[PDB]
Write a protein that binds this ligand. Sequence first.
Ligand code: GTP
Ligand code: ZN
Lengths: 69, 49, 82, 80, 75, 750, 246, 29
Amino acid sequence: VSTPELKKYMDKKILLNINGSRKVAGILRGYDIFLNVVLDDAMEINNHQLGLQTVIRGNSIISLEALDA
Amino acid sequence: GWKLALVSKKTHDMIWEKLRYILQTQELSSTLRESLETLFEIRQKDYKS
Amino acid sequence: NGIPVKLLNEAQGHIVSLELTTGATYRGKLVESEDSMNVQLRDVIATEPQGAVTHMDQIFVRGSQIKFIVVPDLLKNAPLFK
Amino acid sequence: IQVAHSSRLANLIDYKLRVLTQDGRVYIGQLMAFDKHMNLVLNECIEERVPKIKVEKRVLGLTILRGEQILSTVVEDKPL
Amino acid sequence: MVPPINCIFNFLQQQTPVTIWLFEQIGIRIKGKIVGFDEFMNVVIDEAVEIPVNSKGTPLGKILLKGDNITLITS
Amino acid sequence: EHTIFTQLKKNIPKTRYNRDYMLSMANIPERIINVGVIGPLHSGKTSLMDLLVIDSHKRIPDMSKNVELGWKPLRYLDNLKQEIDRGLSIKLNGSTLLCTDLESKSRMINFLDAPGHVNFMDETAVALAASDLVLIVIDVVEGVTFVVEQLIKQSIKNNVAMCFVINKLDRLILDLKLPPMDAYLKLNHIIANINSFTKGNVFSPIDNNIIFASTKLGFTFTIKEFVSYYYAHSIPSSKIDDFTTRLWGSVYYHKGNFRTKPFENVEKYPTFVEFILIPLYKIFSYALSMEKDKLKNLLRSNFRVNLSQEALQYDPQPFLKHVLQLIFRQQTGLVDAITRCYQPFELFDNKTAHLSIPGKSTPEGTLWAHVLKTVDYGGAEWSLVRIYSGLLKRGDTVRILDTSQSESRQKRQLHETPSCEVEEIGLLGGRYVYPVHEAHKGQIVLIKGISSAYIKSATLYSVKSKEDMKQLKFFKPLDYITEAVFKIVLQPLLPRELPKLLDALNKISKYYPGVIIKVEESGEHVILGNGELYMDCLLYDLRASYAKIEIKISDPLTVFSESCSNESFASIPVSNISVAAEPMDSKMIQDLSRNTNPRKLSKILRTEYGWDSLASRNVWSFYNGNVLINDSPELLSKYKEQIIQGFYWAVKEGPLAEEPIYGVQYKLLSISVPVMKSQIIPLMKKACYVGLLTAIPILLEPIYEVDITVHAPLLPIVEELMKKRRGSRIYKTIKVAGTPLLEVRGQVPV
Amino acid sequence: SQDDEYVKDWLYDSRPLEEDSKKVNGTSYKKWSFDLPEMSNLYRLSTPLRDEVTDKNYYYLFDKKSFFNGKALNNAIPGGPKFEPLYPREEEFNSIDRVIFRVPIRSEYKVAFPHLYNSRPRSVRIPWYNNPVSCIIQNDEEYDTPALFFDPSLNPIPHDFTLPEDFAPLLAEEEELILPNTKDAMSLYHSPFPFNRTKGKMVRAQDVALAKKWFLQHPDEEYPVKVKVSYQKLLKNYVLNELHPT
Amino acid sequence: SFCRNCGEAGHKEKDCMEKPRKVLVRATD
RNA sequence: AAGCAGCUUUACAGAUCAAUGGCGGAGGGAGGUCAACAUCAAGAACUGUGGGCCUUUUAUUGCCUAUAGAACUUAUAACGAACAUGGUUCUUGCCUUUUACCAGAACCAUCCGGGUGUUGUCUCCAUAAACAGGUAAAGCUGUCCGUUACUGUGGGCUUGCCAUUUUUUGG
Ligand SMILES: Nc1nc2c(ncn2[C@@H]2O[C@H](COP(=O)(O)OP(=O)(O)OP(=O)(O)O)[C@@H](O)[C@H]2O)c(=O)[nH]1
Ligand SMILES: [Zn+2]
């Protein structure tokens, strides 16, 4: 019923934390009522970059920190 | 106005109500609105002129 | 509304702990807790079950993988119960 | 360890509950709040983990528990 | 705000190559195009290739993708 | 003889909440919301705080049976004896309450009853300087007056949040006898005026912007409150939000549908009327007139409450207040409105910057608090302090800077402070002081030991290091909304009681902020205040609480500022610096009276008012109302601040009647200069005096703008009073909608 | 009949409702409580002996405290009584050399704002500054108007998603916005103390002051000398009784 | 105006002589 | 807010006709121009219980805390939505001395009365309420007696309802 109010959290370099103790880097380009996450891709978790913009199903995300200081 | 009030008060009341409706529950013109306002004012004093 | 969602909304600002399904026990201030429990933390220290300890600025959690949250004992007294 | 002829969780509120969880942990302590999802907000929570023996005992206090992580709850005795 | 709804519409517009990670599906990536759409994550991808990752090319054809298994949807 | 105040901690009222929990959550900077409720005269805002206080506390001892019924309003924050017998609020008096949202997120709210009488509005400015959010309580039967317009404009100009408790709905339903369609058009007219006088911000009961109330009758309600109490079970729980956003407006409802246009054969009421007002109209009319044995069935079936056996045998006004306190069962939705209106990040960073210097931030180790005013609270004197950073304790050494000295040290901050220790700290309760050891960030509190080392407002700060006072921000001298104009001249009757009166005036210059006390030559004391009721409350405070001596006071007098209106026919030098004088433009003096480096000033003056370039580049400084223009650069800038201090000392006390000089521009044409500074400042003031008197002088008269509410057939009588008093003109006669009143926005000299 | 139907059975008794039990405490006759039709009938029959002054703002210069200020300041009010000066007061600062004469200070100013317009007041009670502007509609048309209508003195006002069909408003069971007692109950609701309520205790027959209403108002119009002297002297007795709580 | 009680002119409801429903004078003295 | 599950209730159909356990009972209701005792002008101000702390011996004072209660009047402050009278002293008037006065103040009083609590008495209407200990008072307690503690009909609601990411229909 409640939508995520990340509207002052937009365009942040996010360290995601997903299934498998893995991490995803991405700037916060857009979201919606499911909290699916559009993010511009970066070096993903010796290290590699795949994708251009990713739509993230939120059930993958264990947590996410904002490295944007 | 005054005469109307004296004789057919109910009728006058009805008329007033109608006017009010026109003012509020209808997209009236500016001039029309002004006229309505004037009428209301007159009613308040009961035809001073 | 759900009573623990209210009690998490009433703990917004104190130092709460957060055990997750990956075991990543976070601890710090609370910022947000919606009806669907998006939990946000400032001044948060992180402790893993493996012994990994980190510190970070501000974190978001999507609530689908939260085990439990340790509320402080300050909210036991008042006011949502009686 | 006793009980009355109880019907549902709300009439047995504040009691000394043992709570079984999916992750091999047993939470013992009193209750203060529930929900539709059996979201127990335990009053004086003590967490019991068994690393492979010895019951790793942990003091928590007042904890909101998300209900999907819960397996089943046990009623022990009266409070106070 | 630009939605992931309209971002999957932009994936429909573009059909650029795809590197999907999958939720509790470790050594399988799905590559190809993104065409479908639902109010849920129901989509479709034809001529899909399931790639295990360094952490070969396994034979696979079409996929109707029922979205209970998704970590990434990228293009 | 002075207050109603509970000194005893065994006789403070118990709360439903726990006050120890209230302090225990007070450390959180984002919970505590400061509400300074400001209003017009007699808006019910004190009565609004009665609802919150009676909801919070278990048993107030001051509630008699006339209150527990609900006959006489429990004016609980009106504790001064002047506030008792005048029937007004005269000083800032609020409370600290825990208050729950509809989500039951309970927060500490520090209320502040701004006095709403228009000659008290300086202290309302205190409440505007103290508050994150403001409940602008608005009469229905008077509507948006000019005072409402200025409170809106000033709360926008202080970067403070906006909520409107539209009070007095029973005066629609019972005083004005209005039908629901006409009262709905009345509320449309009020909210349309509100959304006109606010710049780009829509307020509507669709949002949580506007709360409705009639606070004599025990209730207030948001539409979110009313839907979430009573339509929460008839509607499935996913459809609440887009229902509450279809209540207010021209939305209609027959059976399940929602057309914006009305229907054909049923012609019925809008959704707002039929879902909000029409049950509320039926509540009022059935609590008054219906037989009692049917009211229990209606309030049990519909509103799910029970009338007790004591509640059956009440009287119509307390029975109706008890019915409304069962239906609108508390004041929760008001607090949910205050919660959903104010955000900390988007408003607080500019609200901490308007009443200070706009800077980056402060460290959280150092302390930074705004001492708003001393208060003559119960017992001794306290000091109303909002902590913007840090943590105060009892016995904390802290430095105090009176804000009159806050500009000049700010210049020294561009590029020593009396540190009085805190004696005691208590929460600003109402008629009780709850002593608290620790006051946190964002918590309005009262402090004893500070009230000596300053006069009106202070910047209370503790610094721990050397470089952390470099980035410190000082608070401005608090912009009171009306200048003190109404003058009395004061002298004690016996000359031997002269020092005590001085001490009394010291207390007054602390207690009442807007009064300014000028000590003249003859031993007389010019006392300047905002108006008449301000002055006789001031003089009761002299003659009965502070001095207890007998006073000779003069008549009503006025500041009579001296000014210019024409060319000066002579540029005559004076020796003991030949300077002319020109009048300011009317638009320019208006733009300068709202107190609005050099390249921005030169570009604004040259592209707005039509200035010369030589006049725009060559300006010393601005005192308010009057500018100083230049026409050997070392000899100019060698005595820069000496010329400007002589200019200040000249325009503070003019040539004719020792008066301020307001509205004259000085053109320093030339200067003939040869221990020098003692012959520059009085030569500068003689030069300014000659420059004034070479033009033909005018004596300026302050003009009150008048608010008049009069029942319309008593309208020409007002013109009689506007005629028989000279200088008085009616400028705008407004028909206040839906009421028999007229608002006249006239003007009259002071 | 048919206008005084609720009270005629018991208006003219020795004690009106001493025998009945649902209206009165008992035959000791020490408490009373009325139904609103009985109460509205008692309101309507007693037009000549009640307060038609229902506004409290009418007593601006005419309060108890206003008369206390008139007494303490040797000062007359036109409708108000005159007294002795409480203080025998006799004899640079407040001379005509230093006084701007613009507003002649009428004594109504000196009783209205007593600390401002008086050099040297003492024993002065703080006067009740005004009530808000009582906009009470009087409904004085021959029992012809409903209880809720738009009065002739009122200024005019110059301005998918679905739900269940059985989703009703609150109080949708009843159609009538007003009742046959609503026009009477609203008139009762704005009345002063005797009629403002429907229960109370028995204030005795010598303690129900009926003419006290008449000299606490202004004199009506063009009454002669002796009658204005009567109003002034009865106000003088009233204020000498209110100054001294025994 | 006239009387609300009886409709006759001259007096008000507070000084009407008929009971509220919803001439010759001893003079020349 | 129709229904079902649950809980509670009375009319009950039922297990014992036990030992239990809840509720209710261990001498009524309405009152009365009935009186008796309190109590009613104040740190906005009240008591109950308990702890702790200070005198040179812990006594009568006075505080800090914990909880349970504050009936009656009180804010345009007052038991009374009304209002008299008397005394003393001072200051005015009438004056021809006092009483009787004019009329203001200050401090006191006296009268018509009033509220609330408890006790008792009286009137009207009714009617396992049995035994034992005490106080200034009560089912206060012990023994004890009805519906009845284990189901179903009939009422009330304190609740829930009428797989597709964030819990309950699978990592
Ligand atoms: N008829 C009616 N009167 C009301 C209502 N609400 C308040 N009042 C009256 O309005 C008065 C408002 O006075 P307060 O609000 O207590 O004092 P205040 O508003 O702080 O006064 P100021 O500070 O001078 O503005 C109250 O004394 C009430 O008698 C209402 O809803 N209906
Ligand atoms: Zn008549």
